[PDB]
Amino acid sequence: RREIGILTTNKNTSRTHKIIAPANLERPVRYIRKPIDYTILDDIGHGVKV
Amino acid sequence: RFVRTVLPFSQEFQRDKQPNAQPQYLHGSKALNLAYSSIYGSYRNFVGPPHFQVICRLLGYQGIAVVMEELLKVVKSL
Numbered sequence: 001r002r003e004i005g006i007l008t009t010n011k012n013t014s015r016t017h018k019i020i021a022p023a024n025l026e027r028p029v030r031y032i033r034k035p036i037d038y039t040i041l042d043d044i045g046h047g048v049k050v
Numbered sequence: 051r052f053v054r055t056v057l058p059f060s061q062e063f064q065r066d067k068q069p070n071a072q073p074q075y076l077h078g079s080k081a082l083n084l085a086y087s088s089i090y091g092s093y094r095n096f097v098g099p100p101h102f103q104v105i106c107r108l109l110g111y112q113g114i115a116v117v118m119e120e121l122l123k124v125v126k127s128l
Binding site for chain 2: 001003004006007
């Protein structure tokens with residue numbers, strides 16, 4: 001066993017599941033209407049105010 | 051499966067064919083000797099899983115190790 005052991009290395013094979021669902025499932029978000037807002041980019045770069 | 055090469059590449063070397071002893075020292079009788087040599091006739095035309103299976107048992111871990119180590123030396127030399 002010592003003599004054959006010289007020619008061996010660990011085989012990196014492991015077992016897992018076909019599908020693993022995430023720890024937290026994505027929460028379904030309700031649709032809420034909101035108007036067109038032209039100020040939402042003012043804090044990005046050199047913005048300009050009304 | 052492995053099979054033998056073509057004639058011009060077949061590197062032959064003379065084998066010292068053993069003198070035939072009495073049947074009792076082989077399979078038991080002439081009839082049994084003939085029967086068994088026919089049985090094993092199938093295995094002479096290739097090298098495959100059954101041959102490898104036998105080689106494995108008969109050599110054990112130590113025989114395999116030394117053969118592998120020596121095959122490596124043949125390869126290193128070539």
